[PDB]
Amino acid sequence: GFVVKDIHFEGLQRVAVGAALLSMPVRTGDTVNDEDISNTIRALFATGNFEDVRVLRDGDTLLVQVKERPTIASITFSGNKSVKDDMLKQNLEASGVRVGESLDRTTIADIEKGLEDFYYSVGKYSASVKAVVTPLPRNRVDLKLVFQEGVSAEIQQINIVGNHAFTTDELISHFQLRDEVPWWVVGDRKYQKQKLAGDLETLRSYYLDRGYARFNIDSTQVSLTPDKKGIYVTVNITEGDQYKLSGVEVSGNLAGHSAEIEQLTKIEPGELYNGTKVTKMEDDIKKLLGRYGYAYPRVQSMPEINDADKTVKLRVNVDAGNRFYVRKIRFEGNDTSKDAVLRREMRQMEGAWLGSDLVDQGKERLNRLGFFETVDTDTQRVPGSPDQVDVVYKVKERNTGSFNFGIGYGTESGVSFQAGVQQDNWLGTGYAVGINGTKNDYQTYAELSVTNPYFTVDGVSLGGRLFYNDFQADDADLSDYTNKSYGTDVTLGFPINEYNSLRAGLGYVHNSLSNMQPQVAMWRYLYSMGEHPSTSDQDNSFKTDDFTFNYGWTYNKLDRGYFPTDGSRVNLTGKVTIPGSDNEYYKVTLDTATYVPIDDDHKWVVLGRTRWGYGDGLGGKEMPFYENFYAGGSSTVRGFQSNTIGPKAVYFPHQASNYDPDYDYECATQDGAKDLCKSDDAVGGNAMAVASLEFITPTPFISDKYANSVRTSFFWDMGTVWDTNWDSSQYSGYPDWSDPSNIRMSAGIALQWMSPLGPLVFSYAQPFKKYDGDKAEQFQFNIGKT
């Protein structure tokens, strides 16, 4: 034994006598053996203040001796190029190492090697972090982290060994990692390395989804060059033979649902094994057992292979598992966004039965808002309950507001300067506000918005615009006029289905025309409005105050957002003038894309586009010439100039304030004002009908490694505009512009990929059937107009 009269200290500096005592098990007066002293030492270490401790028996007095860890007095850097002194400083406080705390001296070489892996992720494998610790007069240390990051390492080959039915290139075609990028070009992934897991996953699926049921990735080695600048990658594989599916035998805790699972597993006998149909099945089961209360259904499938007839008998093991209940759903980190802002994206109902999906579905539904940097789930069993859980979503909040600027460069547009500012989550309420402007050759647009994405709990949005558009028609390749409009719309957005939406909203427009060079059509509209300005000059003005009911319906079941290979897109907009407007018209436009692949690999898609437009007046009035439908250039019928299809200007004789120098003029007094002049200036119509037929094929001269990056097609475009209120009789001499059987057809070849200057799209069309006064334009393009 041994009895202690006092506890006495040597080496306490920062740690108060009181803090030492409140962590020693052995008290003043206690009876202690060398075992309870070894427990005290053991304990004072567990505090984290001390570097060495020793408790010693000194007669009647227990004596505690300490050397405290040195206080961090500065953290300089000196060497860090690729990581800023602030981003590292913050990451070090997250690891305990900060200024004013004490240095974990045995973790210095840990701190060093701890930072190497930050550098090995990007590929800086030549890197290095030393740490110079300099003692200072009063038990302080100066931590200086000397970096020497190196040449980032680039991947010089991705090889595949055993590939017999597919050239090593076709396979690599689909990997996020690339053995070569091109320039002068395709924006086509980098050339660095990390997390190759998930690229072997696509290699499995390429093989499994073609009936190679016995396919196996034997090994995947990952090499360096001695200089640690180059990186090689081999994935050695074994190709199965092709196996046809025989049947599916289901076996496990089906929770007595064999009735409904025995047809979810019914597969037409003969078709090849299909690694995704398998995981669909597996998911359909987990989605059925989930429909019936079970949170975590497991489902596995090990094919019974039979090399005799070359078939696979899929043995699916079901196991519905247990049933849990959600006591609460809780949110942590939503320090700005309202509780409701996250909770409304929950497909998991709180105070109801757990879904292993609806919790994951409600996480994908959360980061796709993009209000949060990270989104982690955590399902905790409620203490004192075998089947109650809390679902916690730990969010880290992202800076939502941003300034954006984008130059694109298209023909039928010129140079687009899209630019504006946006706040995606106004003070954390899901409300979006922003001021976007786009500036064309013909247009200067500038609108301010306020949107509620959940006006109604089910997803109905109420979005208000407030716009300003100055249109200069003679830059838009139309008859010369100037519309200077502005107004405001409120618009309900109804979500209907995963593929469908409705818009309906009211609108105000102030159209303020001026500088209208006289022509027949433009002027037939004007008598209708009760305005009779001058046939023989260009100094005019029309103020129009319109009130509109707008409505729209959009349907998108495209397989892929980028290069669609399957499914249709259908947008339908229409408006009408609510009684009390200066104008009185209804407008209805409708576009249509339809992709239809012809091969299994889906590199022979057939694109069928159609565009439709129609409107007219109601009270003996007409559709404003500015609400007209045009058809030419890239967006519509290629081979032809922008807007060049349909009716043309039949011009009055006049003079403008131009002061006729030495330029070309249309039906000017200055040059011989007879009566009316026919022109090849276009005005479009109140009745468009364009409809294309593109044949998307492989791109046949470029390396297979990235041939699927570029998309050639062969299009046959045709279109028609016409003027319905054209008096064909009164103007017997001038061409019949109420006749729509004037089908303008063209045929060309398209190319698009993604260059560094942005998304690209070329066309080259010779118009074979063009009619009287149609301006051709054979090579057209955009560089991501934005």
């Binding site: 507001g401 954006n404 984008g406 130059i407 706040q423 560089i783 934005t786």
Partner: peptide, 9 residues
Amino acid sequence: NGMLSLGVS
């Protein structure tokens, strides 16, 4: 798109 973008507002 073109040019760039700042996210700090």
